[PDB]
Design a protein around this ligand. Structure first.
Ligand SMILES: [Fe+2]
Ligand SMILES: [Fe+2]
Ligand SMILES: [Fe+2]
Ligand SMILES: [Fe+2]
Ligand SMILES: [Fe+2]
Ligand SMILES: [Fe+2]
Ligand SMILES: [Fe+2]
Ligand SMILES: [Fe+2]
Ligand SMILES: [Fe+2]
Ligand SMILES: [Fe+2]
Ligand SMILES: [Fe+2]
Ligand SMILES: [Fe+2]
Ligand SMILES: [Fe+2]
Ligand SMILES: [Fe+2]
Lengths: 288, 288, 288, 288, 288, 288, 288
C-alpha cells in the first residue's frame, strides 16, 4: 500500500538554471551529482528531487514509497492483476535511486512511475537549506503533491484509485471560460490533503505544478520576494478552498509551475468527500 | 454508512416569517434563493436549511450524508434488500441540492428522506451570522437533531436502526398524564448524542422539534431574549438528562418547535444504553 | 489593608425559615448554634454567615478581613485619622466571632462594620453542603458581595474608597423610570469584580442583595429549581454586563434578596474604569 | 498615565463613502449616528471610530484612555506643568463622547487630542461585524496605532515622551531617495509594539495611516480581496521588521491610508531600543 | 534577609545509632566524616545534617541561609541593633561548615544559631539515598522545619519575627488537658508553610521535632514500614490542618522526634493569618 | 506474540568482576543470589540480568516475554510448525526463572532462547540503584536490545522474522574495510526501535553488545566517567543514525560490550523501512 | 543598567583562518566586511562578532548593551563618579558599530569596553548559518559569556560589581596544583547564569574563552566532530557544576578557546550564592 510520494525526477534543458532556482530561490539543499543526476534534499533523505539534462523540460518520473518489501510485493501483484506491465528494477537502478527495491511502470498516459521501499537516510549529513527556510514538512506526509494533466480524467481516476489505491479527498469544478468547466480531482494516500490531483487541462506538460510545503509563514513570504525579484511569480499569495494551504505559484525554468505553501489542513478518518466551485478562498490572483 | 444529518427542508405557508425568524432570531446566514428555495447557512456548506412555500408547514425532507460514492452504493443496497423503494436522484435533483449523488425514499410513515454524498462547500463566501452568534457546532456531528413523531415506535425503530444503521443512545420514559407513559428513543450515527429521536407523541407534525447547537452560553442567552421579545419561548432554559444540552425551545412560524442549545456531551465507544424517567435535570419549565 | 469580605450577620424575625432556606435551597452547611447565633459554612472557615433573632430583618453587621495584626493596626489608624469612632473589640467579642483581633465601627449611615484578622479554620470538619452544590468560590475573593443602599452615594463613596480603601471597578446608570436615573458604583478590594456596590435606591433595607458564587452552571440551575418550587424567584437567569456573572435572584425570608451566580470575571492590574447603561447583557427578567 | 489609544474621529467630505468602506470592506460594525457623528464599533465599547462631515478629510481628534479619575488628574497636571493649554471637557462634550471625564488640548502641530476615563461599554449589544471578520484585537492594547506626520520630529518626540509619557520602542531609518533619509520613531504606552509613530514625511495629512489589528490571517486575506476589488490597495501583504505585523495598506476615501494586520509581537519589560534600515522583512510592495 | 533553614547539627550520645537511623530508615546519604562530624546529604549541598558526639542528645545548632554577603551584613547589623551578641565566624569555622561567611549567636533561650552565605554544592557527587527515596524537597524551601520549645512564647516570637524577620503563617491552639491550652505559632521565611514553629511545651528538648519532606506518597509509606519494624513510630499517618502535610512521626535515637512528610501546601502573597483548634484533619493517632 | 526482551543470562569466568561492574559502574541493583545465579534489577521485576559462573564469557540465554498463557501457546505452536525443537520448561526451571510458564529452544546458531509469561514483580522491594542513576527505561519496551553476531544473516533473518515475528526497522550497511560491507539488520517487536539487531560480524562472541537505556543525559555522562576511570570505554559519546540513541560503549569483564544510552526514538505505525550508510550521526569515535 | 553582552571584537593575525573557523566549524553567518572588520551573525542583529587584522590575537573590545539613552546616561554617570575615564563615542564610531549611541572606556587591566544602546536589527536578511546549526540562544540573555583573566581578582571584582553592576552567581575554587587554588567568580547581569567570569589564571590572553550557546544537543555533537576533524578540541563533552551547561572547548586560530554549549540553567530571583570545588560534574576531560 502506497504510503507517500517519495521522490521526483525532472528532465530539463537548463540544469544550471534549475540548480540555482531550487537552491537560491526555494532553499533546497544541493546534495551532489551522481548518475541519478543533480540531487537536492529537503530533509533527512539522501535526495528528494533529481534534475537530469533532457529535452522534455518536464517531470521525468515520480517514486511512490511503500513501507517494506511485503508492500512492494502487494503493489506489484495489484498492478499485474490489472494488466499493467511492471518491471522489477534491477540492482543498477535501485543503486542509482538509493533504494532497497523498486518496480517501474507507467500511468495510462505515459508518465514513468516507480514504487519502491527502503530509501537512504543521511542523518550524518544534517540538512542545511540553500536559502533561509526554517524547514520543509515531509515525514509521513511525504514530499508534497503534483497535479497530473490528462486527456481523460475518468481513465486516470480509475487507474489511480482502483489500481494504485489513492482515495478521493474532494473535487473542484474549475470554470475555464463560459463553455468550459473542468473538474479537478484531489486524491490522498496519507494525512496530506492530496498527494496527487488529476485534471484534464489543456497544457503542454505532464503536470500543472508540484508543491513543497514549508514550516512557517515567513518561509513563504521570504521566498515570494526572492522569486518576485526575477519576475517569476505566476499567482499572488492566497489560500486554497480545499486543502487550506496558503501559497504562491512561480514558474520553474521548464515552464512547469511550483507551488510553495504553508499551513495546509490534513485529512482524517472522519473526512467526507465534498465539492467546491472555486479553488481559492482569497488571493491567488493570476499574474501570468 | 450514514455519517450525519446534513440538511433539512421545510415547506411553509409564510416564507417571509421564516426568513426573518431564522436570520434575526436564530442568527443563521441568508444564502440566497434558488429552485431549492430560500437557503440558509450555519457553516462552510453552501446551505443547511432550505425554506420552500408549502401547505404542510412542517419538515418536507431531510438529507443524511455518507462519506463517498461507495457509501451511497452501500445504503442503496441495504434499502433495496429491505424492500424499500429507492430512487436514484437525477442530475437535476442533485444540482438543485448542490450534491454529487443522492438517492431518495421515505420513512415508514411518509417522511421524504435523502441520502447523498459530495455536498458543496463555500469557503470563499465566509459565514457571517444574521445575529450575534459566535458559531454553530457542526463538523463531524452534522447539522443537529430532530425528533420524529410516529404512530408506532417499534416499526420506526426497526427501520432506523436495522435499515438506516442508527444506534440507540438511551431512552426516556415520558410521563404524559397518569395513564400515559411514552418512551422516547434517542439514536446516534456519530459522536453527537443523538441525531434522531423517535416518540409516539400525539402531534399534528412530523417532528416535535429540530435542534441547532451553538458555541457559547452567551449565544443561547442572547437568542433567548431575541425570541422572548416576540413571545415565542415555549420552554425556559434547562439542561437535558441524557445529552446534557443546555437549551431553550421556541416556536417557529410553522408551529414546529426549535431547540437552541449549547454544551451537549458526546457518545464514545465506552457508551452504554441507559434509561431515564425525566427529560430534564433542571429548567425547561413549559411556558406553552 | 482590607483583603476581602469575610463574614456577614443577619438579624431576622424567622430564624427557622432562614435555616431551612440557606441549607435546603442554597446548600450552605449548618455549623451549629452559639452565642454568635445559628452558624453556616460554605468553605473551610468555621462560619461565614450568622443568623440571629432580631426585628430588623436585614444585614446586622459585615466583617472585612485583613491579613494580620499589622493590617488591623493600619486600618484602625486610618479610621481614627478620619474621625471615625472605632472600638477595639474585646476578647469576648473576638471569641464570639472566632477571630484573633477585631475593631468595630459603623458606616456613615449606621451599618455596623467589623475589621478583623485571624479567623478560625475547621479543615478537620470537612464542608458538606446542605443541598447538591459542587462548591462555593471564596479563597482570596472572600465571601462574595452585597449592594449597600444609601441616601447619599457621594458620602458613601468617599467613606468606602478614601477611608476603607476600596477601588472603583465601574458604574452602571440605572434607569428607574423616565425622570430617575441612579448610578450604582461597583467597588473591589481584591480580584473579585466587586465586593461592595453602592446605590441610592429607595429601599426599606440596608442592602439590595448579597451574592454567593458557586463552582458550576449546574449548581445554579439546580438551585433555581429548588427556589422556584416555593415561588421565591425575583429575576430569571441572566448575565451581568459588568462582572459577567450568570445568576438569578431570589427573596430570602427577610425580604432582602440573594443573588446566586457563577462564572464572574475578575479584575486585574490592567483594569480601567468604564460605565454601562444596562446591568444585564441578557436574561434577569424581573418576575417580582 | 495613558493606558492606550481609545478612540479616533475623522472629519470627511464623503461620509457615505466612509460608512460603506468601514463596514463593507473592513468589517466594522455600524453603531448609529449621534451628535458625535456616524459611530463604528470593533469591540464591546459603544464606539471606537467616529466619522463627521468635514472639509479636512483627515483625522480630526484622537482620544487616549487613562484608568480612572486620578489618572486624568495626573495627566492634566503634567500638561499644565509643561505649559500646555488644557481644557476640562464640559458635561456636554463628555456626554457626546460617552465618557465620564475628559480634558482636551492639542499636540505641538495642531492635532486636537483628548485624554479621558470611563468610556461606555455595550455588552448588551453584542458586536456583529459588517463583513466576515473573526474579531479585532483591542483589550489592553487599545484601538491600534497611527503614524503622526510632523514638520519637526524632535519637537514632536519631546512632547509625546516627556509630556504624554510614551516610551520609545525602536527607530526605522526610512530611505526616501538618495539625499533623503527620515527616521520614523515608534512609541508604546502598553504591550502593543507601538500606539504612535512619528515621522517628518512630506504629506498633506496629519497621519500617514491608522491601523486595525484582526484575530486571524484569513481576516486579512479576505479583507485584501474586498479592498482590491475596488482598486484601493496601496501595499501588498508583507511583514514589518519592527512590530512583525503581517499587513496590507489601502486608501480610505479621504486619501489617508489604513493598515489592516495580524500577528504583531508585543513589547515586554525586557525590551531594548533598536534601529532598523528597512520597514519590512518581506512583501509590502508599493502599488501606489 | 533569611532565605531558608540551610543546615542543622545534632550532638548525640549514640552516633552509630543516628547514622544507621538516618541512612537506613529515612534514606539520607552518608557524606563522610569531618571535624564538622558525620555528614548527611539530601540534595546537591555538601551536607544538610551533621551528627556529633555529645551529651545533650538534641539539636546543637541550626544554620539559616542568606543570599549573599550583603544579606549577611544586613542580618549582623539587625542583630547588633537589637543588642544581640553576634560573633563573626572565623575562617576555621567557615571552613568546618563549608560556607563562605557566617555569624554566630544564640536565641533568647540558648539555642546556638548561625546565619551564613555561600554553602558548598557537590553536583559532581550525585545524591544517592541510603534507602529507596525518590527525592527530598528542598530548593528555595530549604531543609524543612523544626518546632522550638520555649518557656515563653512571646519573648521567642518577638525575637524571631522582629529580629530574625520570620512572618507568621498561622496559630494552632493546642489543647493539652482541660486546664491547659498552648498556642503553637507557625512562621515562614519563604514559600514553605513554616520553617519554624514556636510553642511553650513542657519538653526536656530544645525542639519537639524536625521535618524532612519527600517527593512522593510512596516515599512516606515505605519509610513508615522501615521505622515501624523497629517500633519507632510515635504518630500514625495523618494530614495537618495548617500546612496540609501528610506525615508520620517517629522517635530518633535522641528522643527528639522526626516528621517525615509529603505534599505540604505553600504560602503565597495572598496568604492571611488564621487560627485552628486542631493540628490534624485526620490521622496522626498518637502511638506513644 | 512476543512483547519484549524480558531477561538475559551471562555465563562468565569472573562473577565478582561482573557484580562490581554492573552495580558500581552501570548502577544496577544487586538482587541476591539464587540457583539462577547472581541477580540484578533495573526496575520492579525480581531480576532482569543473571550472572552465572561459566567458561564461555558470553550471553548464555535470553528470555522473550509474551502477555499470557495463550501467547505462550501460540509461540510454541509457531515454533513446532517451523520444525524447531521446543521444550516446555519444567516447574523447576520456571521456579528458577521466577516465571509462570516458559518454553525453551535455540536460535539457528545455538543461542539458547526462552519465551515465557508471568514474571515476578517485587514492588514491595523498591528499586535502589547501585550508583547514581535516575532510572532505566523499560516498561512496554522491555529490557533493551542486543546485537546477535551470526555466520549467515539471511538464515538468521528468516528465523527471527518468519518464526519469532520480529519486524524490520531498518538496515545499516557497515563498511568494514574496502572489500567488506556487512549489512546490520535492526528488528523490533514493540515501540523500542530495535530489541534485536543481526549482523555477520567476525567476532568470537554470540553478541556484539547489549544495551541498557537510562532516563537522563546525566545518567549517561556520570556513568561514562565511572567507566572511563578504569579505562573501559570503547566508543566515545555519539548518537546513532537509526534509533537516535545518544550513547557510549564500554567493555564488560567478558569482552562483550555494553551500550549505555538515552533518548532513543520509538517506532510507530507510520514507520517505513529505510537504509543508512553510517551507524552514527556524530561521536562514537572508537577508542578500542 | 547593563542588560547583556551585545558584541565582541577580535584582533587577529590570521583573518582568513578565523572566517573559515567561525562559519564552517561553529556555523556562524558571514555578514560582510566593513570598516568594523569581517562581521559575523548568530541572530537578527546586524553582527555580534567582528574580526579585524591585528597583532594581539585576542579579544580587542566587548560591547555591553543598555536598554536606551537613559540607561547609557546612567552608566556614563556611574563611571564618571567612580573616576573612570569615559569617552562618548563619536558619530563615526557609532556608525562603524551600527549603534545609536555609545561610550568607551577600559577595565582596570586595559581591556577596551563599550556600553551602547540601539544596535541594528536585520530581520529583512534572515539568519542562515554557515554550518548545520538549529539556532543560537541569545535574546534577553545576550551573546554569551567570556572569562576575563586578571592579575588581581579583587580589584577586577570591585570594578565589575560596584561600577558596572554585575551580580555574583557563584564561585568555583580551581585547584591548579597542590600549592595553588584560584577562585573563579561567575557574574550575571540578566537570566544567563554568567555573562562574565573573573579569575587570576596565568594566561597570555585577556580571556580564557568565550562561549556561544546553541539550541540542541545535536548542534553541539555535530560541531564537536567538525572541530575534532582538525584536531582542535581542548576538552571533551561535559557538564559544568554551576551553570549546568553541556559543552566542549576548542582552540580558535588565536589560541583563545571557545566553549560551544547547550542547556545551561538560568538565574532567578530566588538565586543564592554558593561555592563549588569542581568546575564539572562529568566529562570535560582535558585533551590539551
Ligand atoms: Fe481516506
Ligand atoms: Fe497544489
Ligand atoms: Fe455507537
Ligand atoms: Fe432536542
Ligand atoms: Fe484596583
Ligand atoms: Fe450582585
Ligand atoms: Fe516600556
Ligand atoms: Fe502601522
Ligand atoms: Fe509572608
Ligand atoms: Fe511539623
Ligand atoms: Fe512494525
Ligand atoms: Fe545498540
Ligand atoms: Fe541577581
Ligand atoms: Fe564558560
Amino acid at each position: 500500500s502506497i504510503r507517500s510520494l517519495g521522490y521526483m525526477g525532472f528532465a530539463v534543458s537548463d540544469v544550471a538554471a534549475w540548480r540555482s532556482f531550487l537552491t537560491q530561490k526555494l532553499g533546497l539543499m544541493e546534495a551532489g551529482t551522481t548518475d541519478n543526476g543533480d540531487l537536492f534534499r529537503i530533509d533527512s533523505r539522501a535526495w528528494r528531487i533529481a534534475v537530469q539534462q533532457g529535452e522534455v523540460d518536464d517531470l521525468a518520473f515520480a517514486g511512490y514509497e511503500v513501507a517494506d518489501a511485503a508492500g512492494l510485493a502487494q503493489m506489484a501483484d495489484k498492478l499485474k492483476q490489472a494488466g499493467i506491465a511492471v518491471t522489477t528494477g534491477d540492482a543498477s537502478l535501485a543503486r542509482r535511486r538509493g533504494v532497497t527495491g523498486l518496480i517501474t511502470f507507467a500511468d495510462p498516459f505515459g508518465l514513468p512511475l516507480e514504487i519502491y521501499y527502503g530509501a537512504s537516510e543521511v542523518f550524518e549529513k544534517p540538512f542545511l537549506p540553500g536559502a533561509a527556510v526554517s524547514g520543509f514538512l515531509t515525514g509521513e506526509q511525504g514530499l508534497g503533491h503534483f497535479v497530473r494533466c490528462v486527456p481523460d480524467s475518468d481513465k486516470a481516476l480509475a487507474f489511480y484509485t482502483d489500481v494504485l489505491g489513492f482515495q478521493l479527498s474532494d473535487v473542484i469544478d474549475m470554470k475555464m471560460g463560459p463553455d468550459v468547466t473542468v473538474p479537478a480531482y484531489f486524491l490522498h494516500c496519507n494525512e496530506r490533503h492530496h498527494t496527487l490531483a488529476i485534471a484534464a487541462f489543456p497544457l503542454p506538460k505532464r503536470i500543472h505544478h508540484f508543491m513543497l510545503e514549508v514550516a512557517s509563514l515567513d518561509d513563504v513570504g521570504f521566498a515570494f520576494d526572492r522569486v518576485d525579484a526575477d519576475g517569476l511569480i505566476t499567482s499572488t499569495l492566497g489560500r486554497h478552498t480545499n486543502d487550506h494551504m496558503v501559497s504562491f505559484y512561480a514558474s520553474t525554468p521548464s515552464g512547469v509551475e511550483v507551488e510553495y505553501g504553508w499551513s495546509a489542513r490534513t485529512v482524517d478518518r472522519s473526512w467526507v468527500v465534498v465539492r467546491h466551485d472555486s479553488p481559492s478562498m482569497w488571493g491567488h490572483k493570476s499574474v501570468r
